[PDB]
Structure 1
Amino acid sequence: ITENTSWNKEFSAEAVNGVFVLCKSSSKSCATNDLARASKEYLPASTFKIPNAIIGLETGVIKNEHQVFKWDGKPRAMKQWERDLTLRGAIQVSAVPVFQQIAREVGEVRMQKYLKKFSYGNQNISGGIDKFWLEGQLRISAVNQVEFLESLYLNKLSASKENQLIVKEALVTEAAPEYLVHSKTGFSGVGTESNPGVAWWVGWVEKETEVYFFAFNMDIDNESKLPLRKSIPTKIMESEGII
């Protein structure tokens, strides 16, 4: 891992405390704006839908790629979650309640087992089975997100290749003939000024025959600043020629 000092230009303008980790081809060739923060561990928030989806499929909690998660007609925290959702839909709109129920059906024992298998952060799922990723003790770093996503990319997670392929298609966010982005956002809340929340954007880009793995997180105490989780990384990647 190398430090790229020029990438802090993007951070300084908004007064953002954050890290971007960008790896070309594999996780052996990574660069970052902040070496210290690259392996600092933060709540995963909705980025945990990735492992959770794979585990749901692996355990049979989620039947297959075409399972519909039906809305019961009761109030949800976001209006965009108040509807029937596919697995991809639930991931893409970050429908928390769908994955809370998946996590419950998975259960603590199976959840612990798979996070050990995936080497997923501090592997600490205390804080409640339906909230450990958002309010609990689970922490993961940008470096670890890249390692995990690389494994997913190569189908090297301890899960079926079928199930890894399913979750991979659910993560597509940008598609062109020779350009494909898989990605996922995360946002833990605004916390306080003294103890800010965290915002994430993680994933990988396939450009022509090259692949780039990325993970961004930042402290956030103001919800207005949220779009910087995609705009900072995008600006960095565009400056490096990643279309």
Structure 2
Amino acid sequence: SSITENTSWNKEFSAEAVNGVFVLCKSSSKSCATNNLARASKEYLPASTFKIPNAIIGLETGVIKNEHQVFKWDGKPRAMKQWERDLSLRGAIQVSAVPVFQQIAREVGEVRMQKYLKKFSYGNQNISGGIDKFWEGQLRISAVNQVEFLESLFLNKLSASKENQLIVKEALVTEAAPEYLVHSKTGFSGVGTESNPGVAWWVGWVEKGTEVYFFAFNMDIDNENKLPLRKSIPTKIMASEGIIG
């Protein structure tokens, strides 16, 4: 990767008293820009952004049959009212259904999980604390790594079938307009404390005309009411560059 630091973006962060980073690449990871070079490379807990490789590995291992797979509710209550019904792949990904993905992780199993994440170069690679709970635990990944990983997915270069990479790419679509398709994923580890804060993510890419823009955002967060900033800050920056608004 090749990355240029521009301090100007810092305004949008200052305005909101947000401690964070944004990494935006046009065409490829040979062309990225960021507000904070050091935070760009620092690794954080992926939280639900981990649903992306989990889904790929799920599909690739046969744990997830195909894009039409339904994730049946077993009747037994789920801890969130949004998960208490049947879900598609895209749906499970949009609502971040924790029991759905833990179950995928349990059936993938820890040896296969580790192997795929190694092939993927996905973060620091640590899955300790239990197999259903490592995106909350030891595994850590930077903003730059996230864009690298998403770029590989975009180009079908992950060690996975082209089909399964396509399936995952479509389930991640969150906005469509005549000129562009936005593929994205949120993450939030929890509030943590004021002294030690939780992390919030928005990662994805934008297919605009013949161009592509990869992006990854994170921020320290100690209050849930700051959560929408994880989308508004990157959106303002991309608007200002004339990408999307």
Q: TM-score scaled to structure 1, two decimals?
A: 0.98
Deviates most, 114-123 or 88-97: 88-97
* Percent identical residues: 98
| 1:54 CA drift (Å) | 0.3
Q: 2:12 aligns with which of 5, 10, 13?
A: 10
Distance 1:239 1:115 in 2: 35
| 1:175 CA drift (Å) | 1.0
Distance 2:66 2:55 in 1: 11
Distance 1:123 1:3 in 2: 27
| 1:216 CA drift (Å) | 0.1
Distance 1:77 1:187 in 2: 17
Distance 1:88 1:224 in 2: 25
Q: Which residue of 2 aligns with 1:231?
A: 232
Distance 1:171 1:113 in 2: 24
Task: Give the secondary structure class of the aligned counterpart of 2:151.
Answer: helix
Deviations 1:123-166 (A, max 9, x none): 11111100100x31000000000000000000000000000000
Deviations 1:203-230 (A, max 9, x none): 0011111100000000000000000000
| 1:74 CA drift (Å) | 2.2
After superposition, residues 13-52 of structure 1 pair within 5 angstroms as 13-52=15-54
| 1:176 CA drift (Å) | 1.9
Distance 2:177 2:233 in 1: 22
Distance 1:31 1:166 in 2: 29
Q: TM-score scaled to structure 2, two decimals?
A: 0.97
Distance 2:26 2:53 in 1: 23
Distance 1:129 1:95 in 2: 16
| 1:169 CA drift (Å) | 0.4
| 1:95 CA drift (Å) | 0.9
Distance 1:221 1:78 in 2: 21
Deviates most, 169-178 or 208-217: 169-178
Distance 2:158 2:130 in 1: 25
Q: Which residue of 1 aligns with 2:176?
A: 175
Distance 2:80 2:141 in 1: 26
Task: Give the secondary structure class of the aligned counterpart of 2:9.
Answer: helix
Distance 2:157 2:184 in 1: 18
Distance 1:127 1:161 in 2: 32
| 1:73 CA drift (Å) | 2.0
After superposition, residues 1-243 of structure 1 pair within 5 angstroms as 1-133=3-135, 135-243=136-244
Deviations 1:10-68 (A, max 9, x none): 10012111000000000010000001100100000000000000000000001111010
Task: Give the secondary structure class of the aligned counterpart of 1:102.
Answer: helix
| 1:77 CA drift (Å) | 2.3
Distance 1:132 1:110 in 2: 15
Deviations 1:58-85 (A, max 9, x none): 0000111101000112222221111100
Number of residues paired by the alignment?
A: 242
Ranges of 4+ aligned residues in structure 1 off by more than 6 Å:
none
Distance 2:46 2:161 in 1: 23
> What RMSD over aligned residues (CA atoms) do the two structures have, in Å?
0.7
Task: Give the secondary structure class of the aligned counterpart of 1:71.
Answer: coil
Distance 2:149 2:51 in 1: 13
Query: Mind listing any 5+ residue stretches in structure 2 that lack a counterpart?
Result: none
